[PDB]
Amino acid sequence: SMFLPPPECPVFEPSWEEFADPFAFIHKIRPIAEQTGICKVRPPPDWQPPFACDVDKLHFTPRIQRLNELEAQTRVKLGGGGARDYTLRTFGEMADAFKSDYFNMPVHMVPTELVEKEFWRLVSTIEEDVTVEYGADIASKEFGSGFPVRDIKLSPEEEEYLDSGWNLNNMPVMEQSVLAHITADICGMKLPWLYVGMCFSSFCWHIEDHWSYSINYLHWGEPKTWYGVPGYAAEQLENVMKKLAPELFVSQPDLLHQLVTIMNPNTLMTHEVPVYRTNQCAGEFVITFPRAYHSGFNQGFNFAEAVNFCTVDWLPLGRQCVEHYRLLHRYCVFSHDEMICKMASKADVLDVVVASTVQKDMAIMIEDEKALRETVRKLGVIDSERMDFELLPDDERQCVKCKTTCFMSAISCSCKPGLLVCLHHVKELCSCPPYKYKLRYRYTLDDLYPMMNALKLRAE
Ligand SMILES: [Mn+2]
Ligand SMILES: [Mn+2]
Ligand SMILES: [Mn+2]
Ligand SMILES: [Zn+2]
Ligand SMILES: [Zn+2]
Numbered sequence: 001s002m003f004l005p006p007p008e009c010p011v012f013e014p015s016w017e018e019f020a021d022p023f024a025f026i027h028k029i030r031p032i033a034e035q036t037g038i039c040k041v042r043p044p045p046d047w048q049p050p051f052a053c054d055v056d057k058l059h060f061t062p063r064i065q066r067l068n069e070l071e072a073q074t075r076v077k078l079g080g081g082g083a084r085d086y087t088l089r090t091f092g093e094m095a096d097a098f099k100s101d102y103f104n105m106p107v108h109m110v111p112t113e114l115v116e117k118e119f120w121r122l123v124s125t126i127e128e129d130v131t132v133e134y135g136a137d138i139a140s141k142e143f144g145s146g147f148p149v150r151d152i153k154l155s156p157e158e159e160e161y162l163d164s165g166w167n168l169n170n171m172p173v174m175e176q177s178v179l180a181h182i183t184a185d186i187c188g189m190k191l192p193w194l195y196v197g198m199c200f201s202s203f204c205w206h207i208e209d210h211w212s213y214s215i216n217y218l219h220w221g222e223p224k225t226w227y228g229v230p231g232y233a234a235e236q237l238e239n240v241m242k243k244l245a246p247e248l249f250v251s252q253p254d255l256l257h258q259l260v261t262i263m264n265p266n267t268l269m270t271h272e273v274p275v276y277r278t279n280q281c282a283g284e285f286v287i288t289f290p291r292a293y294h295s296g297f298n299q300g301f302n303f304a305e306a307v308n309f310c311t312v313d314w315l316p317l318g319r320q321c322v323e324h325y326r327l328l329h330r331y332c333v334f335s336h337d338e339m340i341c342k343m344a345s346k347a348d349v350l351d352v353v354v355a356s357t358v359q360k361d362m363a364i365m366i367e368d369e370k371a372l373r374e375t376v377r378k379l380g381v382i383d384s385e386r387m388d389f390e391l392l393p394d395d396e397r398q399c400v401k402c403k404t405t406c407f408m409s410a411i412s413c414s415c416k417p418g419l420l421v422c423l424h425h426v427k428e429l430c431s432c433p434p435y436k437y438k439l440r441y442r443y444t445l446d447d448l449y450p451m452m453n454a455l456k457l458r459a460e
Contacts, residue, residue, distance in 0.1 A: 003120045005113075006265050009228055009276035010039040019044055022165040023176045023311060026213075026287065030313065036276045037292030038228030041285040048283070049161040051146055051219050055089040058143050062086055062133040065201060067262065069123040070245045073204055075258035078188050080137060088196065088303075091135065095198035095301035098132070102199065107222070107300050112279055115299050116225055119200055123262050134298075135196030138188065145169050145192060146219040146305045166285070168192045168217055168307045175351055178310040178318075179212070181343050184334050184390070192307040197224065197298030204260035205241070205295040207234065208288065209333045211321040212308040216286045221302025223279040224286075227265045231291040233273050240271045255331045262295070290317045312357040319361060326402045326424065335407040337365055338390055341442070347454035356459035362452050369408050370445060372423040379426055380434035381411060387440040401425035409441040 010032050018025050025041075033039035061082035065073070086094070099107045103114075122128045139145045147167040148158035161167055165174065172190045173180050179190050189209055199222075208214050211231075218224055229237050241263065242249050248259040265275040279299070280286045288294050310318065322336045343350060343358045350358070389397055389407045397406045399422040410420040413430050420440070421429045429437070443451075 003117050003264075004266055004269075005116065006227060006269065006275040006277040009033075009036045009226070009278045011042065011278070012039060013042045014044070016044045016047075019047065019166075023174075026311065027313065030289070033287065034289045034292075035230050036228060036274075037230040037233075038226055038276060038278065038286055038288050038294055040278045040280060041287060043166065043283065043285070047166070049147055049164070049167065050155070050157045053088070053146075055092070056087050058088040059085050060088075060091075060135040060137060060143050060196065062091065062135060065132050065134060067119075067123050067128075067130045067132065067200060067202070068126075069262050069264060072245075072247055072259050072261060074256075075204075075206065075260050076136070076188070076256070078138070078256075086133075086135075091133070091196055091198070092301050094133070099199035099300050107199075110300075112223060112225070112299055115199065119202075119225075119297050120264055120266075122200070124264065130200065132198055132201045134198060134201035136193060138191045138193050139169075143194060146194065146217075146303060166217075168215065168305055171215075171307050171309045174309075176311060176354065178312065178315065178339065178343070178354075179308065181346070182334055182339050183342055184338065186334050189308055189333050192305050195304045195306065197221065197300075197302040197304065199300045200297055202262060202297035203295055204262055205237070205293055206258075206260050207291050207293055208308050209255075210310070210336070211291040211317050212310045212314065213290060214288045214306055214308050216280070216288075216304055216306035218280050218282050218284055218286075219303045219305060220282045222298065222300030223281045224296060224298050224302060224304060226278045226280060226286055226294060226296040228276050228278075228288065229268070229293040230274060231289055234291045234293060236271075236273045237268060237293050240268060240273060251329055255333065290314055291321075312354055315357055315361045316364075319364065322404065326399075326404045326422070329402050331398070331403050332394075332405040335389075335405040338405075338407040340365060341407070341451065344451040344455055347451075347458045350455070350458055352459050355455045359452055359455035359459060362448075362455065365408070366445070366448050366452065369448075373409065373439070373441075373445075376411065376423050376426050376434075376439060381426065381437045381439050382435060383437070384439040384441060386444075387442065389440075389442050399425055401428040407442055409439060411437050412440055413437050 061080035062084055103110050122130050147169050148162050150162055171177050268275050318336050340362050404422050406422055411426050412420055413432050413436055415430045415432050
């Protein structure tokens with residue numbers, strides 16, 4: 001009556017056979033799980049990656065979090081800095097005492113249902129001002145991955161798991177994650193993040209950059225409670241949230257200024273947005289699918305690790321996402337077309353199903369590019385010059401108007417040195433007549449078709 005828990009998301013228990021290839025497995029469950037946005041994956045009983053670390057030598061700078069529903073929070077502070085510092089031990093001592101004192105109970109006697117119910121009570125009650133702390137950072141020397149990494153001499157147990165597809169360190173380089181081919185720096189997106197949780201520390205409603213998948217592993221500790229919404233209902237959810245908290249939707253000039261919030265799943269459910277839940281326990285995986293909104297909170301002291309990835313399934317959505325970013329004037333993490341062309345240029349060493357799928361996206365790219373160039377020629381842009389867009393830092397090749405990262409082409413004018421617009425915004429560069437403009441382009445149409453043909457040959 002005050003909190004009605006959403007229905008449970010799918011839970012999968014793959015055999016060692018199914019578990020052997022994560023991408024094949026994820027492809028298998030996709031028809032089911034994309035309907036719920038998140039799913040939980042239980043590895044085979046004996047898949048037990050060894051965790052070991054010194055709780056006194058691992059330190060991190062804590063982030064502070066107020067717990068008020070609908071209140072604005074900023075997504076990531078990928079740079080911590082800070083003066084406050086916990087070791088894993090001192091944070092754990094703080095975390096356990098907090099939970100223990102909050103409920104006046106020992107921590108594993110506090111029922112998960114109760115913590116959940118209480119969480120939604122405290123975030124909605126205005127004069128409760130509970131604040132908590134948490135850790136969130138990419139792997140570093142002061143704090144590294146929870147999975148085995150090859151360096152230091154390792155035990156045969158760690159060696160068995162060193163190359164596992166489910167070892168999340170391996171997805172920044174695994175063959176069928178399209179992100180692995182990106183030569184551009186996308187560190188904040190490609191490397192695993194480490195999260196140290198405590199009771200009620202939470203992650204606001206969000207979707208991944210470029211609508212990528214994510215996969216989260218809870219190494220140890222108390223559970224992590226999740227809420228998930230399927231990709232098809234993304235705009236539904238956004239409409240509900242814009243109505244209840246429009247501040248979050250004002251434009252901001254950074255990827256370092258994305259605004260997000262806590263919001264009761266019952267609110268979404270009242271507005272007919274489908275929402276699912278799960279308690280992720282130690283040793284379990286949660287997977288989020290493209291454009292699946294998700295949020296949640298930790299039940300107590302714990303340690304999780306997560307990473308983004310992109311399968312070939314995702315390529316058309318990646319293209320749609322950047323188009324969606326353009327309409328919103330949202331910054332890109334990388335150029336999707338640049339990634340496509342990078343892959344085309346490596347067609348011979350590409351996996352063959354990958355090659356086939358890249359070829360299809362490239363064909364759309366080329367077709368759209370052809371049409372755009374015809375339009376800008378008709379606007380009176382005549383001069384042109386080839387330009388190696390991939391050499392420019394990102395902040396020197398964003399469209400003035402829509403902020404998209406240019407790669408296929410842009411318009412410049414000697415009137416405004418260094419400024420560029422994409423071909424959707426030829427009118428937005430300056431007041432000079434179009435005959436003063438240059439079309440800057442990475443490839444001629446004639447360069448492009450042979451690149452696509454290499455993919456076709458590789459794929460047959
Ligand atoms: Mn409150
Ligand atoms: Mn996420
Ligand atoms: Mn516009
Ligand atoms: Zn533009
Ligand atoms: Zn000009």
